[PDB]
Design a protein around this ligand. Structure first.
Ligand SMILES: [Fe+3]
Ligand SMILES: [Fe+3]
Ligand SMILES: [Mg+2]
Ligand SMILES: [Mg+2]
Ligand SMILES: [Mg+2]
Ligand SMILES: [Mg+2]
Ligand SMILES: [Mg+2]
Ligand SMILES: [Mg+2]
Lengths: 145, 144
């Protein structure tokens, strides 16, 4: 393995966080569909699939560095929200937690002088920041102020 | 809702079982990849994606009948096997469990005289049976 175990575990943790992200967006879709919001459910379904490509990017990086992936149990997500804005605000809050979690790994890899992982994570935060901004675009679009 | 609650819950149980199927196959891929078995990992990754379309078919049927889907926690799958055959035999046994679970929902829908759900499950079980036979084909290919 050409990464430290500490970094491997953090990346594996993050991969599992991307999986939970995908499941949370699917659960938001079950809520939107239960309320009849077909189009917003479809947005959530495509976002759930986008989250799986995030998990597979971490998957591929870990094996490239000689690590292995270990899948953990997935927590039951919430199944109800109080309207569209309420669901998308919960997603914004979740993606901000995800963005900070990735910045934490990048700090760790930087302290270890793990240049390859620093490069990987620097590239990925740019995609995470735009996925967060996609959530903000919806909230701004519905801002019925 | 034009299905009974016990039927909706059985279909919802099955949906979550398909999710766990997808996760198990991804876990087998993490094992195959750690062993360097790249082509078999790719098989498992495709199969995991196939399992998500199974989940979404139960998803679509539940809402069509006026029900709702509730996602449950997914249990941690095993992460290690003792070789290729060992992993695929585990997959076969899981798919045989899945096949019997679908047959049990069929018996329940048929005693309720839920003709729409009986039709749905007869259609789907044919797909489940070919996915089972896909696993058997790999085991037969690797035999002895
Ligand atoms: Fe993500
Ligand atoms: Fe299946
Ligand atoms: Mg998006
Ligand atoms: Mg240096
Ligand atoms: Mg197959
Ligand atoms: Mg065995
Ligand atoms: Mg009748
Ligand atoms: Mg098919």
């Amino acid at each position: 393995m050409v990464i430290s175990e500490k970094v491997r575990k953090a990346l594996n943790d993050q991969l599992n966080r991307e999986i939970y992200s995908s499941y949370l967006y699917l659960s938001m879709a079950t809520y939107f569909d239960a309320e009849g919001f077909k189009g917003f459910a479809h947005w959530m379904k495509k976002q759930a699939q986008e989250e799986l490509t995030h998990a597979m990017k971490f998957y591929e990086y870990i094996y490239e560095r000689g690590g292995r992936v270990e899948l953990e149990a997935i927590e039951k997500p919430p199944s109800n929200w109080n309207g569209i804005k309420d669901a998308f605000e919960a997603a914004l809050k979740h993606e901000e937690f995800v963005t900070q979690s990735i910045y934490n790994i990048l700090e760790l890899a930087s302290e270890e002088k793990d240049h390859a992982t620093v490069s990987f994570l620097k590239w990925f935060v740019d995609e995470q920041v735009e996925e967060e901004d996609q959530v903000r675009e919806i909230l701004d679009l519905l801002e019925k102020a």
